[model samples]
Target: PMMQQYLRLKAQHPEILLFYRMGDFYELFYDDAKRASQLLDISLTKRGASAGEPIPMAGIPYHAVENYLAKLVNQGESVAICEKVVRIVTPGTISDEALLQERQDNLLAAIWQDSKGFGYATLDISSGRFRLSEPADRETMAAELQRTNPAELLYAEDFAEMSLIEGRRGLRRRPLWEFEIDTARQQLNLQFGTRDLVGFGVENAPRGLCAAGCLLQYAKDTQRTTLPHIRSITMEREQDSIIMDAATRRNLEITQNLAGGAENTLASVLDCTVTPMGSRMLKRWLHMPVRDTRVLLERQQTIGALQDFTAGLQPVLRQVGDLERILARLALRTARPRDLARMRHAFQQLPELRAQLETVDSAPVQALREKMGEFAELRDLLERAIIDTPPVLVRDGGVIASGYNEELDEWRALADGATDYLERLEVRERERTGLDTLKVGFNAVHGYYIQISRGQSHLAPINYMRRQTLKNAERYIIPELKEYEDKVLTSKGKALALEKQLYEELFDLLLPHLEALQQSASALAELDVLVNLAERAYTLNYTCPTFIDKPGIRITEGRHPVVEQVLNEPFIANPLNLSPQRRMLIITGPNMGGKSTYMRQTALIALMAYIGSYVPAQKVEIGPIDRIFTRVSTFMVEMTETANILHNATEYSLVLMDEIGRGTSTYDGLSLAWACAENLANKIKALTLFATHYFELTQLPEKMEGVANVHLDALTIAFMHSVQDGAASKSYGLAVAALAGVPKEVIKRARQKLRELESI
Candidate 1:
């Protein structure tokens, strides 16, 4: 029968590990047991026979299952929990704090495609960020997906062969009918309690609506709960932000480094956000830089205002915790008493935060200040309902405030008086037995009883029924004692039940304010990111950039944002001047001489300015760039990356190419690099930085009108990592090698060979 139960649950969710709850432990059977044993590194044992063979079994304590779930979901696995309350666990659907990262969003995404275009939807259940987008082409869709970096992806079965859907983590193919537009629209209307999707501006976006509906359906099915926190959907348009492809993002190291980790990356350097919601918002802004000049200026103005008052605002912002996730948990009804208390504490900080923001004298800051709501009613209710320090589990009791509810107070009074009542009962029993050592006790298995010491067993009365025998005592219970036991146990149970009921009532009272809390979270997140930006700007001496409608980019004294922060020594700052008259910069320098640094810093400053952050420069002026393309190295994926850049880059694009075409033989590599540079200068006319060791490229300025030569100043014995106005006279390869501690003999040989080549 046990095996049959396991089989039935496993059959329903074959893709997930079935966690069959058995008392204190959650057990797994057969293949599930083996997989759990392997993944969790637990012992595999056997249970009673199943079809004449011992059943394979492995289990973990239910209390500690969250840690295992974290590991499994992070590794792109799912779990099914079989208990009194059955549920499915996916990476994005998990509500347990132990199974989630406090700072990062656990996003679930869905995609659907038709002949017209591709639709996409993403949801972070923890943060309650739900958005939908429809991209016109596969390339845009791919870039959007990369930017989201969803924890799980669901797609229609027929579109499994699409290249855009390949190599994603946690990819699942749903049946085709689930993605039907009509069905999806109906699902959306039903979930959102609306008659039509037009109010959300997604009526025309069939594919996007389909993706959004399917995602919500999957979430509801997996979580087995209502999603009241996800009250609305956001429609994202393609032109809403600046577009950066996966290759460009990878080359720029916007969020993560190519090698791994956030250290020495742009996000890491600029991320001074104190709250998790703010941290996530900053990352999102970096990933999707805004293209609108008006929005950029507004952000810059707000940041400027905040910079003047950071000393007063930062402390208040830090006190505002991650309310987004807390609201989500509360809406899901999975929040602990501590979560509620923390939410209340965070809410209490809102008035102070708003006051701090109100001191700032900018329109954007004032708008944000107006958006900040002091949730007085909700906060007061929570403060009165929950104790200061409640237990982790709400069911354990002591969660509700003593003076909050009359019924709960009465039950607690009865429960608390049992101690004194039992003490009096014990005293009377002791006097009657004539045994001063006789005591009364209680346990879970047995109720109240009288215990007589072994030496005083004969003093126990004959009416005292023998209940249990101990090494040094004899336990007995009489009719009168049993009646008192019933009263005490019943009082305790009723008190606990009343406390739980009161807690639920408090939750219900707070439920209606979830939307307001979510809005406040969004405003606080924006404020936090703005404060961080302002702080960084003030500390780093960054300047707000000027945006022009023309087609050139110019920056004075620009430094690499991440490198400057990471390096112990001061970074060398350089000026960048690119215009229609000199649109392409041919930078020829030796390896490790700061050529790549100069190009990357220039691009980063332009990107930062476009995103409305104070750039790491003294002054910057930039025009709109439609796209950014970077082919930085000759590595394993360099060929396809180069092809993508060459095929897609346009006149308004900004391109950075470093050591391009170096994957092949010397002659072929130089030829390809020369042709690519010529195309960029003579045909594409895109503002470009082409850093190469090929000295021949330095001659391009004479051949092409827009091409100009720049270099890193290097010497045979010493190198200054600074950009100059002309190409280097020599490669200085041997000198760099010597400086890098290559063998003396090898360096000497390399110099001799260089001399020979010079003579030839």
Candidate 2:
């Protein structure tokens, strides 16, 4: 019978483990048990016989399943929780508070295509944030996907060409019928309770709507719950944000470093957020920098207003918890009493948070402050209902406050009366038995009873009914005691049931206010991110950048944000100027002379200015840049990267290229780098920083109008890590070798060979 049940559930979720609820543990059988045992490092044992052989079995305590679930989902495996309710657990679909990263988004994405182009939709079920976009080309689609970095992807079954979907962690294929436009439209209309999609701005986007609809359907199927918190969908437009390809994003290390951690990244240095929502929003802003000049100015203004009060604002923000996900769990009806208590605490901080923001004068900050809702009624209800420190499980009693509900209080009183009666009964029985060692106790198997030690069994009263015998005692119960025991047990059960009912009633009362709470949460998250940016600027002494309508970038004393933070000694700042008259800088210097750092600093400053954050510079001015392209490091697909940059970069772009073509032969590499620099200077006319060891490229200014030469100052004995006007006098290879503590003979031989080559 157990095997049959396992087979039925296993058939439903063939790819994932079926965690069949068995008593206090969730057991896995057969293949599921074998896989889980191997992955979790648990012992694989056997259960009852099946087909004349023992059935493989492994299990974990139900209470501790969240830790194991995190391990499984993070390892890119899905699990099906088969209990009283069946729920699917995937990396992106996890809603358990203990299983998710509070600061990171677990996005489940869906992709679809129409006659026009490809569409993508992403949803964070935990926060109820839904977004959709339609990319114009495959390259843009790829970049968009990378920016999202979804934990799971859903596609149609006919999408056999897995090349585009390669490297993704989780992939699920659905039938083509699920992605039909008509069916998807109906699904959207029903989900949002709207007859038309025009209100959400996706009326014209057929592909995006299809993808979004399929994503919602998949979520509903997996969760098997109502998603009332996901009230709206946002359509993202390409023109609203700056577009950076995968290669450029990786080279810049905006969110993750080359070694794949938060350290040494721009995000790491800039992250000073206090709340999980703020951290996620900051990462989203970095990935999708705004292109609208008005929006950027507004953000900068708000940040400026908050810079002075960040110290005060941070403490207030610390009180504001993750309200978004908390509301999500409440709406899903999966919230525990502790979750409600935390929500109450967060709501209690709204007034103080708003008061802190009121100190700022900017229109944006004031608007955000006004948007925050205090929700006094809901907060008061939660305060009066839930206990301060409720248990993780809501089923246990004591989750509800005593004064909240009259009937619950009465039931608790009845249970308390039972306890008093039992104590009195025990005292009377001890006195009547006349045995000093006589005692009374209760257990699950046997109710209230009188215990007589084996030495005094003969002194027990004859009216005592025999109950049970222990190693050293004989237990007996009287009819009056049994009657009292039944009454106490029944009253205790009624009290627990009453508490549960009261808690559910409180939750129902709080349900209607979810939308308002989410709005307040959104406003608070934005305010926190702005405050964090201001705090970062204040700590680093960064200056606000000025933007112009034309095409150029000028920064005085620009420093690399990450590099400056990491270095032990003071960072050497550099100056940069690239305008229409001189758009490209051909920089030639020896290795480790800060050439790459200088180039990166210029680009990073521009990027920071564009994203509406203060730049790491003494002064800065930037023009409108449609995109930022960088080819600073070589990877496996070097040629493809070079071609992509050359083909896609435009006049309005800012490009940074370091040691391009180094993946090829020496002559071929020099030739390619020379041609690329010339094209970028003369044809593309983009603001470019081309740092190379090829001295031949330094002469490009004479051949091209906008190209100029610059180099790092280096010497034979001690190198000055500073940028200057003019190409390096020599490559300084042997000089760098000697400085690097090379063998004396080897350095001398390298100098002699260089002299011989120069003579030739």
Candidate 3:
């Protein structure tokens, strides 16, 4: 009974062979019958049909579905396999207990590959390792997902939430450079032939097997240093199948056979077109389709320049929406000059388009970049179709025609009779110019011109004639060809005006689109840069990356980029000794006291190295960090979610907090001091830095680790008290803060507070 329903479904999809599921066999009908019969070498037979005549059909055993599916899919034909959803007895039918038990489970499935990568549904009956990564915008929440690279990505209206979840989990992010196995070469080649990381003297990490061992070796031979971090590595297999939906299969217009009516499949596109490289690239674009305005425009701008095509072509061509399908169909038969020209233009634009995409920073522009990149490969494939296996032609005395057609013989005979006369005409034209040159012209209104360059002018050249001049050159016309020149010159002025108008109109249309495109492009570029930086961490692979949870901070071999090169070896990695026991370290050093670098480096190293990368120091021991919130001096109204500094001291806690009460009042500052001390003792129990002139708070740590009172050592040239074990000799806060440009009154008050607190 279900087979009857499947027979009807197969009728609707006559062009595509049906892999109708019945019990165990994947049955086929009609044309699929012949195909399956030939490929499987199975016996074809007439099956009783509910429609009309007996159905011509063949079938493959259910257990061997994958092998047969691969064979049919490789040939570019889709196999529609149906699985039973539910079973019920008809109103007028007598239902038997056996009938209910006999109902079989069946489902329809179609598969193919595209640019995002490979796609497949695998069931390991023994292990149940069923994993899938459908492409979606995973970069939206890259903050959470540490490492994400999907094999193949997919999204449909039905799976929108799934897409969002995948992004949050970081399953959609791809590396700037992917590691791919070049099966033919038997050696790994970086996807785009990008230089080895070590060659650039930068840290690099292996993405997978291809890039891992080989990349590390290259770095050792070059950078002479190990990588800092590598999150994960993976390998890809060749036979991985890329599945496609029946809808997409029809929408992309990929089918099989040309002269014979057949389904357009992936193999057809690959076999008759370009090399595997181009084929893979094409597949990628087809898989990722774009519909955004801004991205399309930016892509247009970049690719149009690279391809030498004007903008708006994408909209116009896509509006028609039949180009890809038409090209696919014609591709099976032969390619035309026009097709080759279009393909050439598109191919030339791809690399530059990709580069522009990488640099884009705007959100909308970035989204657009993804879209453009997706289609670029497929567009490249269409162009390659024109070049490989060029068309055959036979020529006789410059008369050319299709070698396979009889019309070529008639043209050859006529051309032979006229060859001598044509040769004489050519000689005369050449003689007009002193050099071996001839002048030929066309009368198209927008592009009508003559050529008699200086090199050829020696023969029988025409003298200069005048027309309107432009900024860089002179326009000319020949008097001898006055009639032809008049028509051309008249049309030229109108054409110039039209071109100007078109440019203005296009600019007006592009402004908003350009802005949007810029947003997406910029975001993509930023993400690209970030990924590159993460990849850099892998260069420190051999380094012992230790995660420290200390109360104090210390770093050795630390060097600043701008400072190190200018004052080479002059700056030292000042070792830090801090802890909760001695919470506040008020340093009272002279001007230019390495205070700022000390504070900044502590934060920077913690931020960079914690993201699982190399630290600037030879040895680094950072305290347990939940978050490193930094605040430098600024003249602006302070807004707080947790009230003022005093209130923040009362509420939640922070790790490595810095620069509190710098721009507030004295009373406020004192209050902040009391609150910070209380927090360290009880509520906000974590490592705290009460950096200020409120020295009175230092007394609290005597009660708690809790509060450690330590001050930066100052050589005051004073005598009497021998150096103590815990207490600092003297601090130079006034001298240091004043030198850094605190108001004179502020520094004076700060000094007063230091003394008052010391006396207490």
The lDDT for every candidate, in the order shown, is 0.82, 0.82, 0.37
Q: Which regions in candidate 2 have their CA more than 4 angstroms from the true location?
A: 1-14, 23-25, 29-31, 37-64, 113-116, 136-138, 418-489, 633-636, 663-667
Clashes of each: 0, 0, 66
User: Distance (Å) between predicted and true CA of 446, model 1?
Assistant: 20
lDDT of 2 by residue, 1-760 (tens): 5546556645643777878877779888768888899877886777766477566789888778877887888887888877644567877788887778977888999987667788789999988898999886777777777778789898887664457788778788777777888988898888888889898898788888878988898788777777888888899876677668877777788888888888889889988899998998988888778888888899899888889888888888878878878888888888888889988888888788777776676788888887888888888998899888888876768899889988777677768863666678778877877787887788888777888899998788889888898889898988898787666668779889888888888868988887877888899888889899999999988888998878998888889999999999898888888899989998888888888788778767877887789999999989888888887834447667778878988888888888886877889998888888888888889999888887878778888798888888877356688889988888777777887899999998988888898898
Between candidates 1 and 3, the TM-score winner = 1
lDDT value, candidate 2, whole model: 0.82
TM-score per candidate, in order? 0.86, 0.87, 0.30
By descending TM-score, how would the candidates be arranged? 2, 1, 3
For each candidate in turn, give its C-alpha RMSD to the true structure in angstroms.
6.8, 6.8, 26.6
Maximum-TM-score candidate:
2
Tens digit of per-residue lDDT, candidate 3, span 721-752: 11122444345556656756899899889888
* Candidate 1 structure quality by residue, lDDT tens digits, 599-694: 888778978887789999888989878777787744557767777877877777888888886768889888888888988888888889998988
**Cα-based lDDT at residue 199, candidate 3:** 34
